[PDB]
């Protein structure tokens, strides 16, 4: 099996520099070039440059940011990015290449986050309705998870038991920290009667919180 395996995600501070690896296995390393590409969220792909013993070419645009190096004796390539700002937050991919063969095998991608934030546990707030819901046959409840760093946070409801009717929304950044929320819809017959509880785990800060949603 042809396989490209990249290093794990990276969290660094602005102005720092990072090294990512792409390890090749399943084929003769020196027959193919390695290209490095970037994908900013919701955006297209951009080409950084290629590494090959014999040829190292950069996209003009990245030629001060990036340094590409190969170690053919362990068939692994490296991309070094420096003076990082948060505009460098992206998923970085390596692929294998020749003019004739195209990008046929890819690495799984490496995530880079550049931020000055320190680890910070979420506050979790319960979102119960104020009474225009009491009447209805379905009721929507919520959980607001905010001011945390870094991603990810896991949210669940009744420890996993409630899976349908759940929406958990992508975290957004504001003031260097994240905020996310999750709704659950349950039949009015079963709340408050039965317990609905929001469970949040933030492994980076080693925190778990359970909040039961109670009427106001």
């Amino acid at each position: 099996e042809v396989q490209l395996e990249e290093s794990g995600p990276e969290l660094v501070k602005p102005g720092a520099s990072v090294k990512i690896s792409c390890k090749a296995s399943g084929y003769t390393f020196t027959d193919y070039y390695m290209n490095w590409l970037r994908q900013k969220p919701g955006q297209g792909l951009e080409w950084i440059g290629w590494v090959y013993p014999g040829s190292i070419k950069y996209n003009e645009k990245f030629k001060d940011k990036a340094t590409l190096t190969a170690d053919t004796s362990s068939s692994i390539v490296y991309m070094h990015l420096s003076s990082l700002t948060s505009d460098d937050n992206a998923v970085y991919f390596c692929t294998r290449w020749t003019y004739g063969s195209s990008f046929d095998y890819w690495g799984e991608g490496t995530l880079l986050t550049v931020s000055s934030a320190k680890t910070t546990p979420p506050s979790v707030y319960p979102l119960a309705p104020g009474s225009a819901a009491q009447t209805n046959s379905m009721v929507t409840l919520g959980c607001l998870v905010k001011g945390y760093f870094p991603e990810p946070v896991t949210v669940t409801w009744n420890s996993g038991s409630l899976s349908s009717g759940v929406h958990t929304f992508p975290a957004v950044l504001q003031s260097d920290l994240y905020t996310l929320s999750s709704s659950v819809t349950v039949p009015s017959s079963t709340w408050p009667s039965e317990t609905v509880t929001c469970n949040v785990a933030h492994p980076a800060s080693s925190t778990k919180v359970d909040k039961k949603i109670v009427p106001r």
Binding site: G44, L45, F93, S102, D104, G109, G142, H167, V172, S181
Partner: protein, 218 residues
């Protein structure tokens, strides 16, 4: 730099009907060796792209025959003759003929389905939050289609633009609907100066804007 323009940037389709993505280069992509290095990739969410077609019209091994590519000069097409669940994702075209190598913006393929009006809920801030001097008002607009939606907030009858954070889910896998979360963040003092909080959505399913409100006395 050769620019690659894909159109459309989004394309709703029903399973089993037939799609076409156009992709157009800002200059000829014939390489000096004579070959045209135009390619098409498919990326499913949180995955590496995956090669479909190369040299304009050659299918990469494993790729079903429902995919097919064509064009010349600066003008190319990818055609899916019968769309399937596993074909939904983002399609990029790519040019390998001129350095720097470049991609198009992408063309997102989504399942078409029938118009659904959002269920809207508004939630005042929890007393817990208040006691630490913040106030977030949260609005969920759930299970609607299509994605085009405008939310706007009013505090005391008046539009409010700053302090709003909006988040969208992807197209749900079971029912093909979208969902959205809007949050207005205020300081406690600020929240206590005002009385009426409105979350107002405009969506094609309703002539009237869909409105939820509450008053800070209730």
């Amino acid at each position: 730099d050769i620019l690659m323009t894909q159109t459309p940037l989004s394309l709703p389709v029903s399973l089993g009907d037939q799609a076409s993505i156009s992709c157009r280069s800002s200059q000829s992509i014939v390489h000096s060796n004579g070959n045209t290095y135009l390619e098409w990739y498919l990326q499913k969410p949180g995955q590496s792209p995956t090669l479909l077609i190369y040299k304009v019209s050659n299918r990469f091994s494993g790729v079903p025959d429902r995919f097919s590519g064509s064009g010349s000069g600066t003008d190319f097409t990818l055609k899916i003759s019968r769309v399937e669940a596993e074909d939904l994702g983002v399609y990029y075209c790519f040019q390998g003929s001129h350095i720097p190598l470049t991609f198009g913006a992408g063309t997102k393929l989504e399942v078409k389905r029938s118009d659904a009006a959002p269920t809207v809920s508004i939630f005042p801030p929890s007393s817990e939050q208040l006691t630490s001097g913040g106030a977030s008002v949260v609005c969920f607009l759930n299970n609607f289609y299509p994605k085009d939606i405008n939310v706007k907030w009013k505090i005391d009858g008046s539009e409010r633009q700053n302090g709003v954070l909006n988040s969208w889910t992807d197209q749900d896998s079971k029912d093909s609907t979208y969902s959205m979360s809007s949050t207005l963040t205020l300081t406690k003092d600020e929240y206590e100066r005002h009385n009426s909080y409105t979350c107002e959505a405009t969506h094609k399913t309703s002539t009237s804007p869909i409105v939820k409100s509450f008053n800070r006395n209730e």
